[PDB]
């Protein structure tokens, strides 16, 4: 599914990401925008053999298990295929575990390069939440 910006912001708010572990809501929207262009089905094969899945491009080497990745650790104890759904529930569940590590949102490289240090609340402005 291709979420609109406002649509995604209200869903992520309903899924409890506004102020989760010190991160304001716009961080999550901006991250989804640069990680997957708001596409729940996005996939990206990495040179190391892992794949990045879904709206938050969650990696198969550490977080979910797609059965094809070498040192898979499955930290979110979930099959990768559950992250490729139009329902964001499982993506948000795993993302909350990912950000609870001391690396916080720095695990998402597009967030790191395009969002950190920017006015991230701009991503939720002009939206009915």
């Amino acid at each position: 599914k291709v979420f609109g910006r406002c649509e995604l912001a209200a869903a992520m708010k309903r899924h409890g990401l506004d102020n989760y572990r010190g991160y304001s809501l716009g961080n999550w929207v901006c991250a989804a925008k640069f990680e997957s262009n708001f596409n729940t089905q996005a996939t990206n094969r990495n040179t190391d053999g892992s794949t990045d899945y879904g709206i938050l491009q969650i990696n198969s080497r550490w977080w979910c298990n797609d059965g094809r990745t070498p040192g898979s650790r499955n930290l979110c104890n979930i099959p990768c295929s559950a992250l490729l759904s139009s329902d964001i529930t499982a993506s948000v569940n795993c993302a909350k575990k990912i950000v609870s590590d001391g690396n916080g949102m720095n695990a998402w490289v597009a967030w790191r390069n395009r969002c950190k240090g920017t006015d991230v609340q701009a991503w939720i402005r002009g939206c009915r939440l």
Partner: antibody, heavy 113, light 107 residues
Framework: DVQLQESGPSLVKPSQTLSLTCSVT????????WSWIRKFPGNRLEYMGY???????YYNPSLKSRISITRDTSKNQYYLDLNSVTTEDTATYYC???????WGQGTLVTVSA | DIVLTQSPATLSVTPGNSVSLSCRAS??????LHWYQQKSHESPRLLIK???QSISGIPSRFSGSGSGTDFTLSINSVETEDFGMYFC?????????FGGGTKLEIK
């Protein structure tokens, strides 16, 4: 499947260091985040801290920095050290994964001279 | 810290009746609230995650609802194995905290 088991002393004296070990069976400790929770005598639960996959640690500020959590990847165990205990540290300690699905059985530690 | 207040502190009930436990947060925590059961001489058991996400292996009579600051755990026709303590827990902010507990007791 995964099993967790607490061990260490059940009786300690005031001001010493309490060390507990959590033994994990069924999967590696590198595959999750791991925590320590304790229950006081009147059913009061306190989340103590957790160690995440990168080795970073989060500790409850109610413990004033007397706690250390560490893990041993070759033994498949992780640990709790609590310095300068007092009688207020008398409690049932449990180890558990972060998700909260696996818990150990609990070990009652009493602090007394 | 986020303070979590649970009510009633005690609930006496006859098996086959339905109950609702309440848990209120001092600050808005979204859906970041989990519910545990603790029976005598047993480690806590996770019943509900993220306010209403049901968990595999636990009776369907338990359901949770709520968001923000007000959350409820409901038990449709309580059974004798349900008697014990119920605690809510927020994971929105660090340090994680627990509510004071509801005791569920046979009438």
């Amino acid at each position: 499947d995964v099993q967790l088991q607490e061990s260490g002393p059940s009786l300690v004296k005031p001001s010493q260091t309490l060390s507990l070990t959590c033994s994990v069976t069924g999967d590696s400790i590198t595959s999750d985040y791991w925590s320590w929770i304790r229950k006081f005598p009147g059913n009061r639960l306190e989340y103590m801290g957790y160690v995440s996959y990168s080795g970073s640690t989060y500790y409850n500020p109610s413990l004033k920095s007397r706690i250390s959590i560490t893990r041993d990847t070759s033994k498949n165990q992780y640990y709790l050290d609590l310095n300068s205990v007092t009688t207020e540290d008398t409690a049932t300690y449990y180890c558990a994964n972060w998700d909260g699905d696996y818990w150990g059985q609990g070990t009652l530690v009493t602090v007394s001279a | 810290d986020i303070v979590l207040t649970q009510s009633p502190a005690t609930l006496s009930v006859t098996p086959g009746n339905s109950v609702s436990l309440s848990c209120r947060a001092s600050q808005s925590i979204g859906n970041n609230l989990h519910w545990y059961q603790q029976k005598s001489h047993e480690s806590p058991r996770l019943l509900i995650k993220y306010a209403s996400q049901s968990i595999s292996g636990i009776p369907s009579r338990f359901s949770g609802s709520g968001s923000g600051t007000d959350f409820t755990l409901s038990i449709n026709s309580v059974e004798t194995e349900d008697f014990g303590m119920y605690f809510c827990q927020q994971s929105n902010s660090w340090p994680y905290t627990f509510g004071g507990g509801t005791k569920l007791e046979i009438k």
